[PDB]
Amino acid sequence: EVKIVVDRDPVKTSFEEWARPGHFSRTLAKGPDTTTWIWNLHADAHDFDSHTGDLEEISRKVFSAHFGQLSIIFLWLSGMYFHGARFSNYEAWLSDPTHIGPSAQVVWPIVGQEILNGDVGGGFRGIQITSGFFQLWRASGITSELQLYCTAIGALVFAALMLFAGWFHYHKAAPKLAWFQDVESMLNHHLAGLLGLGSLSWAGHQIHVSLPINQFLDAGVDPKEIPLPHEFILNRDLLAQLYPSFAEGATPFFTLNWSKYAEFLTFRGGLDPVTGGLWLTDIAHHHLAIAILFLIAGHMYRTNWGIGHGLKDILEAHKGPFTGQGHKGLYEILTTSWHAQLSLNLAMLGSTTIVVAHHMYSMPPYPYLATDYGTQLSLFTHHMWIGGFLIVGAAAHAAIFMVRDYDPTTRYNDLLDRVLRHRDAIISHLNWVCIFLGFHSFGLYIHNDTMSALGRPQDMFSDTAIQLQPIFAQWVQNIHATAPGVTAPGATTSTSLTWGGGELVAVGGKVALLPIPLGTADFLVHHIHAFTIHVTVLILLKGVLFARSSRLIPDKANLGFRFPCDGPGRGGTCQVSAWDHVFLGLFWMYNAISVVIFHFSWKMQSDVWGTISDQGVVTHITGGNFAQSSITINGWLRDFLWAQASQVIQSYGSSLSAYGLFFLGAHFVWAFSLMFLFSGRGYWQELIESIVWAHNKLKVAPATQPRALSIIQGRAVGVTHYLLGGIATTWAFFLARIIAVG
Amino acid sequence: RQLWFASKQSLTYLDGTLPGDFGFDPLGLSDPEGTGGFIEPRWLAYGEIFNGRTAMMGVVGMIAPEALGKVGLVPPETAIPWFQAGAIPPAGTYQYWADPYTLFVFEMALIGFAEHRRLQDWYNPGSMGKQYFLGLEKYLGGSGDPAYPGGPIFNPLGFGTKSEKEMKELKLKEIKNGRLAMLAFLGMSLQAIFTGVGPFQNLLDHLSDPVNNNILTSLKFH
Amino acid sequence: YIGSSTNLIMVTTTTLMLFAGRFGLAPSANRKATAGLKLEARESGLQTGDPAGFTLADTLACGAVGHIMGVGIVLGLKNTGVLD
Amino acid sequence: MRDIKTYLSVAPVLSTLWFGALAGLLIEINRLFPDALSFPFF
């Protein structure tokens, strides 16, 4: 059945191994042969799979390790709440959120660096933040420095709880294997307990605290006089003075007269004109609706009583003619291998983060988030990068599974077999498309640029010339605009304001949203994204399929997951290891994402954001030039890189100086990485030797013999810096630009 | 051996030798296959009897002071429903010889001596009658059963004088009473949230008017 | 207000499934419905009183879904009023 | 006790302790003799 059998004191808490570096691995433990040793110490620190050969210990280590990862997050949260309480103009920000920048960092004045303390207003100074906590603390009705302090302590305590918990469950009472593999109950609790009861509890706090309090601040009152949140929960008559449905108590909920709670549980849609965010009634309803759906879904898989499904039997009924044995056997290979689960989870959590970034800019959920141009740009950019990386990780661990855990004599699967057998078709067809999109997406930009350069602006691809109208997006925009009429009679308005119809929402002389048009200039760039996404898929997919064998090397599996090459024979076999396919994917992931966050930044400044006249005419930040200048490659140079880098470049001598330095500093690191990617090891090894000789002359030759980095480390350092230089350069480019213009 | 809502798992280990047994256990807890901490069938039994005993004096104090305020010679000042005695300030309080939070720490220290020593005898039988404790060591060794230490300080006259059946009969009475009190205290609470007029009053509300039946009403007030 | 419309709909729904879960019109803890038919009954070991094998965990499921199909019908209140 | 001291003596732990002390020292000197473009003692 399903029970809790654990062990007692597997590994004794002691400090011995803390003074025996490289104890975990048998190879590393003998000592530092050369400096190659101190690099292999960290490269194999967390690879629990290579230390031991059984699933039980690997499990207990990953289970306890997560507790550490969970603990750090709490400590990270604790600082953010603490800092917002002791070093912020939050309470001032609650008075005029429209035109006082959120600041929650203050620097010590040592070497003149107090120039960084910007005049964010509100009688305060400091680094203007952009993570947008302030809109999060207002949407939860905090309205006090004291309440930000107590949660900071509460957040800190849990960190000690988690960190303690990690210790307890690896040294004192560690679970057994049978505990881990019972994945029906695993899903059963997470769906009902974590996901389900998480929302319902939160839908609680919104009903009794965030809603009635924020309804005071939105109504307009000084924060200091809002009765404390435990007054409503005690004095039930106060909730009556706003929400008369709270007189009858919770009995309508029990008599199915649910249309009595219509005051604070609605289906409005749209955005709030006062605060530019969603209607907290909808949000209040939303988590409640989600709560029920998850909770019921929790009760599906059989755990201990008669009722419930069997995850094994579900996978063993779907087998088709084209597919053969179908999903039989996938239960094992998804249960006796952590690298399978980590690869599968990474892709979904990777994808979801992206969808988060597409929704949070079009349905602004927190109050006074819409007119916070510094926040919108950062939050959209941040989760794109997070979403991009995690997807690449799903390729690496899927590739690792093919090399280490896959075995067609015991863990045999049929679908994963058929997929292997026709892999030549899969890559070649994906190869042709990546070429097709390559010619018809970039080429149109090149042809546009050539014709424009020759004085033929009537042969370019644009709205004023040969036209390419996205109709399919223009059609679906139409449908969502008229959905409130027929196909969703409950809704008062559309689910957003970017649908091809409606009206803008103005908050304090700053546009929240308005219908986003889709002309030709948008059609091209959407087919750029379809191109770089496909190419990135090609590299990672090729790595996963060919991680065990190919027509070049027939025994690549025997060489492991990350090996440099197989020598210069057969024409040259540099970079055939699956690790080097993900190594290549990173650049395209860095390429796909970068154009997306360029596309978002220009489209919103040119077509959406911007001030609004008192009369009613709207003037966007860049004057609406995206629809004409974004179709020529030179256009992306003049009017985006050259014209929107002005603020970062001349940011010297004012609080935005720290961005001016990072802008340069990130170039230096980017250009630095090239030394590792372009060159090779055998040159650096020899130059090291001559340097080593001079130290022999003066007797200062070390005993950990100097060595050059290993082949796959020269690449690993090469890509890491390149990514760090590329991402940070955009970081300093964006924040300094948007903070100055809005 | 009367069984109530038994289960195949339950009757593999609930042998009935433990007093208060009725073979009721559908959540895998007392299962002896899985024993880390706090899931030992002894410890759970140890926590079962203690919680009951705390309930057996917790319940009576949860209805004594107001009901004794119904006729008794208690001056009405210290005759109050239990939740307004001072435990829950938002329900009310009363000014005792102290001011609160000094009563707490005093209480937590006095409890600390009895509690921790009460814990050690579970870890190390007979240990608490070895180191010097101002005399009294002759008793604090216990009889070897942590839940039933015995001794002239704990079992002064001595019942269960000599009869295991009686003791088994007695301990059966001790748990079923314990279960009765735990549920009862859970009654005095959930009544308070909904009724909000005090425990013993809420029995009169159903006495003078059985048609009250606050279930159907479900009005909430402090 | 016992016996109004929302009540009769509830009592029929709940009893119909408890009938269904015990007499043979549903998969209880002791009957599993396969990809086709329902009569694939098995043992599960939940020693109880009801001779039909209706356990403590089946007096809750059929009770639970007794209300899920009891709310969807009642909140189809386009012809039985909006407020009771 | 011996094992704790040995661990504290491994290279990375000394580095942060050593450099941290060095950072504190330089910051203090710049707090007391700021701008310091020349060495005007002799």
Ligand code: CLA
């Ligand atoms: C600016 C630099 C650059 C350019 C142009 C390319 C171009 C290409 N790379 Mg690539 N790559 C680069 C940098 C670049 N890469 C770097 C730095 C890396 C390291 C990370 C990689 C890593 C990499 C990988 C790993 C892969 C590619 C792939 C591809 C090809 C897919 C795109 C395609 O088919 O479009 C078609 C070609 C173009 C759009 C180029 C412009 C052509 C224009 C439209 C017209 C050209 C003139 C015309 C022919 C007239 C001829 C004139 C006559 C006088 C001759 C393409 C040839 C993928 C591939 O080949 O598989 C599909 C692939 O798998 N590259």
Ligand SMILES: CC1=C[C@H](O)CC(C)(C)[C@H]1/C=C/C(C)=C/C=C/C(C)=C/C=C/C=C(C)/C=C/C=C(C)/C=C/C1=C(C)C[C@H](O)CC1(C)C
């Ligand atoms: C067995 C099993 C098995 C399966 O498998 C599953 C299931 C079924 C789930 C399970 C069940 C369980 C249960 C039911 C449990 C319960 C318990 C309890 C209730 C306890 C209490 C418990 C309770 C208790 C102790 C209580 C106590 C109390 C007290 C002292 C009081 C005190 C007081 C007073 C006087 C007055 C003042 O002014 C205040 C105060 C201070 C407040």
Ligand SMILES: CC1=C(/C=C/C(C)=C/C=C/C(C)=C/C=C/C=C(C)/C=C/C=C(C)/C=C/C2=C(C)CCCC2(C)C)C(C)(C)CCC1
């Ligand atoms: C006479 C007689 C008898 C019978 C009895 C009876 C009559 C019983 C009943 C029982 C019952 C009568 C049960 C019930 C149950 C129920 C339940 C368990 C419920 C659940 C619920 C739910 C699940 C809900 C949910 C929800 C919510 C909460 C909200 C949202 C919506 C919904 C609705 C979904 C006996 C056997 C003794 C023997 C013979 C004689």
Ligand SMILES: CC1=C(C/C=C(\C)CCC[C@H](C)CCC[C@H](C)CCCC(C)C)C(=O)c2ccccc2C1=O
């Ligand atoms: C530059 C370069 C090197 C040389 C880089 C080396 C040898 C490592 C860089 C030196 C590091 C920083 C060691 C210095 C840190 C020591 C621990 C000493 C610390 C003392 C400080 C506190 C001063 C390679 O080894 C290499 C290998 C493969 C492909 C490309 C390249 C490559 O491009």
Ligand code: SF4
């Ligand atoms: S160049 Fe380097 S990677 Fe390529 S074959 Fe030679 S050793 Fe291998």
